[PDB]
Amino acid sequence: PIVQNLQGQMVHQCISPRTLNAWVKVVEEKAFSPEVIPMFSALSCGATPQDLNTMLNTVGGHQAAMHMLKETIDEEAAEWDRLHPVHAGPIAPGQMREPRGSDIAGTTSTLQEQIGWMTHNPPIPVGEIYKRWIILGLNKIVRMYSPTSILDIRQGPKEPFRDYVDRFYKTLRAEQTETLLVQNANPDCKTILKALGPGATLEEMMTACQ
Amino acid sequence: PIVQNLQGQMVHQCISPRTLNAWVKVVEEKAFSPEVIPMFSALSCGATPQDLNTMLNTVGGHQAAMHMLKETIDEEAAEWDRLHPVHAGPIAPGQMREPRGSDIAGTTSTLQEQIGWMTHNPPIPVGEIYKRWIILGLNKIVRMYSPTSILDIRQGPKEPFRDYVDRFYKTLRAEQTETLLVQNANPDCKTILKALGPGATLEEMMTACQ
Amino acid sequence: PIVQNLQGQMVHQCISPRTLNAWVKVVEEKAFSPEVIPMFSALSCGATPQDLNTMLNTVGGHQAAMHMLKETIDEEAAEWDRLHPVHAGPIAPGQMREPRGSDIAGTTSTLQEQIGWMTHNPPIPVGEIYKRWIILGLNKIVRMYSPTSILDIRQGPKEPFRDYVDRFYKTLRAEQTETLLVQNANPDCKTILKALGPGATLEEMMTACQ
Amino acid sequence: PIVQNLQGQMVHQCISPRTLNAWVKVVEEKAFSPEVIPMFSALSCGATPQDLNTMLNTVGGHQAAMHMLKETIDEEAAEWDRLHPVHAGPIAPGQMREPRGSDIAGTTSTLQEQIGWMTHNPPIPVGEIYKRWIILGLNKIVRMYSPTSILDIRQGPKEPFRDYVDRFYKTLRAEQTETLLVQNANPDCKTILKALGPGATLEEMMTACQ
Amino acid sequence: PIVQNLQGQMVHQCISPRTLNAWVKVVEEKAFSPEVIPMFSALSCGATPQDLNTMLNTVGGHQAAMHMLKETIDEEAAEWDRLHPVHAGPIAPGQMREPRGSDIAGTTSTLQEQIGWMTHNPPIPVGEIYKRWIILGLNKIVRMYSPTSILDIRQGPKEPFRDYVDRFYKTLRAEQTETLLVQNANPDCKTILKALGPGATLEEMMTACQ
Amino acid sequence: PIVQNLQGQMVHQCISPRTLNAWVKVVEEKAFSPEVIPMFSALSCGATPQDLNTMLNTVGGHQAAMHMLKETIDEEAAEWDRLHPVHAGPIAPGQMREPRGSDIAGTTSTLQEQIGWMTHNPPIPVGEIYKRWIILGLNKIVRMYSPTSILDIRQGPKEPFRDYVDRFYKTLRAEQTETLLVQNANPDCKTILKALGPGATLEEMMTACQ
């Protein structure tokens, strides 16, 4: 990644074994649960495009999702090229060529060029642009691998309301609400929630059905 | 987080895999026991609003509590806006716009803006303001998930006083005392504690009933 | 904690996940064995009052002892106030108000004030003052949870002297010696230790009874 | 490796136990799966030829592949010598002799010489040149140890399409595509994929056969 | 410990949780095997007397040995006082009082005084003086807990010579050689070692009896 | 070890618990397999003679090999003294006495002297000289503990060629080749390898017999 040294200069740093290992492990354990997106964004803090490609490549398995991820990256890269056409001309001394979509995705660009963009003044955050494309593609993967629709999350007749709400917002998060939460509650809690009226907080709802 | 480098300047640092992993693990193991609040405050030392949102998002499960947490944040953000209305005008060079509630909660603000507020002179500690809102909301979650009332913590007839006091203050902490501690002691220890008189220390009480 | 950077200035540092985790684990494993006091002092090296309160709060369980710890802190804080009454007056620019007992214990003081005291010239080591109160209170807890009196540590008739001495000084340490060590030895070793005479070293005693 | 200190100078650093251990472990667990190449490139970030040889030597087992790796290195080194013949002459003060293939592969060069090349201005990245040769040789090993041909990856009659696509691109990656993916789908999904037409995305294909 | 910062000044550092934990673990696992002495010396690199006392205090159990260790320290401290009598007089500004035995052992000295001695020019290495006393006392403990005499290490009639030599020098190290190694070899290997003659290396001896 | 600080000065560093622990563990797990030599060289990067002796002393067990290691060190030290006789004379201010063999092996030299040699300009790398002697002695240990001769590595009649080549070069490495690899192949693969002709690569040989 590109970190600021303790003197105030942005320099390149090798990705640490701890960072590499945490990413690999979170995919093995959590696959494409929603909370894998924040881990990816946090672990790739300050990442160059090379670091991002490293992290994606260390994933073994899930190659169907990884391939869908490439197609999303190609979609976003092609959109970047339609909005930012590279102008012909010799690059001035101490300056950087404009990045293409494939340069941001690290396929036609070197690490030294990525460092040049990211440490430019003003910087071209090719790492953050690429990370956004990846998180976009990861969100579609999370959505596709969501097993259950919110319409099928219904409170059991003897299911504690807390457990039901846990399953409800867990499902909702992956599908990516208030009145449906009441409608899918069991008869005994729905009656209590009816009498609470509208505008009740979740805490008030949970307190009323416990 | 925003740390001070070893030269004396406040700079941004990537959240470390150790910090991310410790937070995730403490929620898996301890859920919403009271001691999860100090871990959250310590792990988010110097955190930006983005880091705080990262930590909350890495939580898988407990989505009922996580949703109640958002409602508390929205309550606190809306109160921040009623007390701090943003004034219209162009921001002066080298200065920061006033933060709204949603900027403090990281929903309408960028990392660069959060760094600008937090490293301003004087700084606007949007991270500490947001952390306070979260700890406020976490405390209500801890209180709601407290299973047992202090009125039901009674010493067993052959229960060692030490074990009873352990359960008593554990329950008290989650519910968030002296005379009730005597009243709920078993007959044999209550008689001893009566004769100790008032103003006895816990150490004196424990010594008298062991 | 307040560490000295590699340039020679005392600056504040976030408590590390390693430090937090080690303290929690040592309490889970060792409870209030005597060797938990050195771990606490070493782990809270350079700690502010906030860090000390963090560490104590991360403890789950043992709330009877934790409450006795507060009473010892209140005793010591009140003694600090009787010896150091805060004088009325406006604090001069660049100076710190005198700390009260509750400021040292972090209940009425902010982190910024604690940093001001601890990095003052000369510094007011509110962290070390608070740590002393805590270690004082922890010692009383260790003493109270000591199960066995030294009078009941007697060498078994076929117990190796080494094992006996191990149990003896282990018990002695928690209770917090030479002639009692002989008196509680078994008949066969006591006869040997009699003939050694007084002023023998432990190594001489152990060698004589092995 | 050769890292840039926090002041801006490229200096040599001892390879860390974490880096050494991660490489050894990834070979024990993953052998020569494709994702072992990115781990090798990431763990040897900034590596000198000595560090690269260290990492390869810490591998126990797989000595058949390790020997094939040497033959690839010798092939590449000999090609380097045919393209870069070392010119005779005394090396000027403060300058470095031109590297031979065997100097890049660390067999006829010292660490001090490798540091001289890598920290030269402009630098001769003997580490990156050597790493490229190794990754080249590792790719041939991954290809040779690929057990299954893409022609044998066929969807089972009741196999979920997602699982099939996972096996397909996993196999494809090791062998190192769209129309073959349809042809090897089972009859029921092939009929659906026929009607989708050409130019469908993988996400559209997966959605249509789930 | 007292480390040199990356600028060239000797400053105090908190003992790290890793250092504390490694020492505790090595005592639990290896007790007083000989190789515990090098671990102690390496883990207490640069240690102050306070750090040394911390490490010894974190040991739970083995209190018989720990008490023998104090008696050795008192012996060495008293010898230090007989060779270095403290002269009466006011200490000059910026200078340190001469250390007594009990100051070196950290019982009558503060951390600030230990830092003053250790960072003086020339420094008084009270940490290294104390560490020497401890290693002296630890060596006597290792010697006392050595279970077997070298006279009882005899090669079994079908015991491989390598295994025998392993047990021999292991025992010798704890007891703290060549001709006895031959004498205790079994008849078949002794005959071979006789014919080798004197002045044979261990490698020659092992090769001859394998 | 002697590391270069982030400012460009060679200073001494305490050996880290991670380094100590990794060395101990690799000996417990791998004993004297060949790949233990690279781990030793990597873990002792920049090591002083004291650090090297520390690492060797932390080894418990294998004392037969450890003693053979001392004899190799004494051989090499005595050769160093025959090639570098120390000249009599007072050492000039700011200079270092010439090292003897026993000074390089850390037996008659202090840490401060080792730092003086290693940080001299030009430096006397007593650490690297000592490490070379140790690696020399470790290689003889690896060779002696090699169980199987290369003449006994023969491909089984139904053994996959890959597995055979794995055992072959593993054995060869410890014994420390092409035509013997063919001669020891089973009849079916030998016939194929005959027809390949000479000058075939290992990859061609493996491909032909799979």
Ligand SMILES: CC(C)(C#Cc1ccc(-c2ccc(Cl)c3c(NS(C)(=O)=O)nn(CC(F)(F)F)c23)c([C@H](Cc2cc(F)cc(F)c2)NC(=O)Cn2nc(C(F)(F)F)c3c2C(F)(F)[C@@H]2C[C@H]32)n1)S(C)(=O)=O
């Ligand atoms: C990936 C990344 C770059 C980012 C970001 C990112 C940025 C901003 C915000 C956010 C912050 C505060 C508030 Cl009050 C709201 C809000 N208040 S509201 C009422 O909607 O108006 N909304 N937001 C999202 C915003 F900004 F997009 F609007 C927020 C979040 C929250 C952070 C958060 C997580 C948490 F657990 C508990 C919290 F209190 C806050 N994360 C989510 O909310 C995810 N989530 N989704 C849903 C669902 F879909 F089911 F409803 C559900 C959640 C849930 F909260 F977990 C919970 C079960 C409900 N994250 S990062 C930093 O992680 O690496």
Ligand SMILES: CC(C)(C#Cc1ccc(-c2ccc(Cl)c3c(NS(C)(=O)=O)nn(CC(F)(F)F)c23)c([C@H](Cc2cc(F)cc(F)c2)NC(=O)Cn2nc(C(F)(F)F)c3c2C(F)(F)[C@@H]2C[C@H]32)n1)S(C)(=O)=O
């Ligand atoms: C989250 C965060 C930002 C913070 C803070 C924070 C700030 C200040 C203080 C504190 C410090 C010293 C004293 Cl003497 C008192 C006091 N003395 S008193 C008699 O009340 O007048 N009170 N306080 C709270 C104050 F300041 F709010 F008043 C304190 C605490 C204590 C720290 C502490 C924990 C501990 F274990 C043992 C200690 F000796 C001190 N924590 C609590 O006390 C929590 N607790 N709650 C209750 C209950 F409700 F059951 F009674 C019980 C506890 C308990 F102690 F654990 C024990 C069973 C009893 N924490 S952080 C730094 O953790 O990240």
Ligand SMILES: CC(C)(C#Cc1ccc(-c2ccc(Cl)c3c(NS(C)(=O)=O)nn(CC(F)(F)F)c23)c([C@H](Cc2cc(F)cc(F)c2)NC(=O)Cn2nc(C(F)(F)F)c3c2C(F)(F)[C@@H]2C[C@H]32)n1)S(C)(=O)=O
């Ligand atoms: C908490 C903290 C801030 C502190 C400190 C602290 C400060 C000083 C000293 C100390 C140092 C050297 C000597 Cl020679 C003596 C001494 N010599 S003597 C003969 O008494 O006159 N006394 N002391 C205590 C002093 F200074 F208070 F006097 C010491 C200790 C010792 C350190 C130590 C531990 C150890 F294991 C072995 C050692 F060789 C030295 N620790 C204790 O002795 C604890 N202990 N208690 C008893 C008992 F009660 F049973 F007798 C027993 C021990 C025991 F040694 F473990 C052993 C079974 C016997 N610690 S910290 C740095 O840990 O974080």
Ligand SMILES: CC(C)(C#Cc1ccc(-c2ccc(Cl)c3c(NS(C)(=O)=O)nn(CC(F)(F)F)c23)c([C@H](Cc2cc(F)cc(F)c2)NC(=O)Cn2nc(C(F)(F)F)c3c2C(F)(F)[C@@H]2C[C@H]32)n1)S(C)(=O)=O
């Ligand atoms: C070793 C090292 C130095 C390097 C590099 C390196 C350099 C660039 C790129 C890359 C980046 C973005 C795009 Cl969009 C494409 C592209 N888009 S495309 C449609 O082809 O035109 N192609 N590339 C390769 C390029 F550049 F060579 F063209 C890329 C990769 C990708 C990174 C990546 C991995 C991932 F998992 C998911 C992603 F979204 C992106 N890695 C691979 O693709 C490996 N892979 N191989 C195949 C197969 F063969 F089966 F098809 C398959 C993959 C797969 F993606 F995993 C997935 C199942 C399919 N890595 S490092 C940095 O790791 O240490």
Ligand SMILES: CC(C)(C#Cc1ccc(-c2ccc(Cl)c3c(NS(C)(=O)=O)nn(CC(F)(F)F)c23)c([C@H](Cc2cc(F)cc(F)c2)NC(=O)Cn2nc(C(F)(F)F)c3c2C(F)(F)[C@@H]2C[C@H]32)n1)S(C)(=O)=O
């Ligand atoms: C604690 C500390 C501060 C220190 C130090 C310290 C200082 C110097 C030396 C040393 C170095 C090189 C040589 Cl050649 C000799 C030597 N050559 S010789 C022939 O005697 O003349 N002698 N020495 C000791 C010296 F200097 F004191 F003379 C040495 C050692 C050796 C280091 C070593 C360990 C090892 F495993 C293998 C090695 F090749 C070298 N350690 C020991 O030898 C311990 N040991 N003891 C005996 C026994 F008693 F059985 F014989 C046995 C050993 C043994 F080697 F393990 C092996 C089975 C035999 N350590 S530290 C740095 O560890 O933290």
Ligand SMILES: CC(C)(C#Cc1ccc(-c2ccc(Cl)c3c(NS(C)(=O)=O)nn(CC(F)(F)F)c23)c([C@H](Cc2cc(F)cc(F)c2)NC(=O)Cn2nc(C(F)(F)F)c3c2C(F)(F)[C@@H]2C[C@H]32)n1)S(C)(=O)=O
């Ligand atoms: C200890 C230390 C200081 C050092 C060093 C050190 C220094 C240089 C080299 C080296 C580098 C590149 C090439 Cl191409 C050759 C070469 N090409 S060749 C055809 O012979 O002419 N030779 N060398 C040794 C040189 F330089 F001495 F010649 C090399 C090695 C190789 C590194 C390596 C390991 C590996 F696994 C795979 C590689 F591609 C390269 N290590 C070895 O080869 C060890 N080995 N031994 C044998 C055997 F004996 F069976 F044949 C076998 C190996 C084996 F490769 F593992 C494999 C099964 C065969 N290490 S360190 C840095 O580790 O800490």
Ligand SMILES: [Cl-]
């Ligand atoms: Cl790491």
Ligand SMILES: [Cl-]
């Ligand atoms: Cl790349």
Ligand SMILES: [Cl-]
């Ligand atoms: Cl794969």
Ligand SMILES: [Cl-]
């Ligand atoms: Cl509830």
Ligand SMILES: [Cl-]
């Ligand atoms: Cl980390």
Ligand SMILES: [Cl-]
């Ligand atoms: Cl954010």
Ligand SMILES: [Cl-]
């Ligand atoms: Cl979830």
Ligand SMILES: [Cl-]
């Ligand atoms: Cl009690």
Ligand SMILES: [Cl-]
């Ligand atoms: Cl940490």
Ligand SMILES: [Cl-]
């Ligand atoms: Cl506080």
